[PDB]
Design an enzyme around this catalytic site. Sequence first.
Site: not given
Ligand SMILES: [Zn+2]
Ligand SMILES: [Zn+2]
Length: 141
Positions: A17, A108, A123
């Site tokens: 075909c 001191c 003191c």
């Molecule tokens: Zn065919």
């Molecule tokens: Zn003293």
Amino acid sequence: EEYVLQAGGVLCPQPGCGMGLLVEPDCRKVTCQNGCGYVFCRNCLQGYHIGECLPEGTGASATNSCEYTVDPNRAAEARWDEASNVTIKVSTKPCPKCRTPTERDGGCMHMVCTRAGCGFEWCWVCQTEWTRDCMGAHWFG
Ligand SMILES: [Zn+2]
Ligand SMILES: [Zn+2]
Ligand SMILES: [Zn+2]
Ligand SMILES: [Zn+2]
């Protein structure tokens, strides 16, 4: 919708075909109705089917397949020790008046009680009340 167009056609896969098959965009049935009529696919010779197909191979060997999940931990510990051994010393002597802890001032030999409600001088060397006896005979560092 009024537009003339054309889709991809195909040919009869028969060696005897090859007349030509016209496939319409809205057509889903290919058959050699004009010749050796047999139903086949437009992309393959599977004899017609539904789904995907590609000539000369689809080119799909693999895709995706992986399933695995893991668990976490979120578990830990925490601790802390403050300290140990506390040695306390005393550097103050109690005031003769208010009895408050009076500390000495290095350099001191005089110390007076600086207290909110006292103000009593005495003191350092010889602790006594400020009088004529020791008015500060040795009040010098
Ligand atoms: Zn065919
Ligand atoms: Zn003293
Ligand atoms: Zn096919
Ligand atoms: Zn005092």
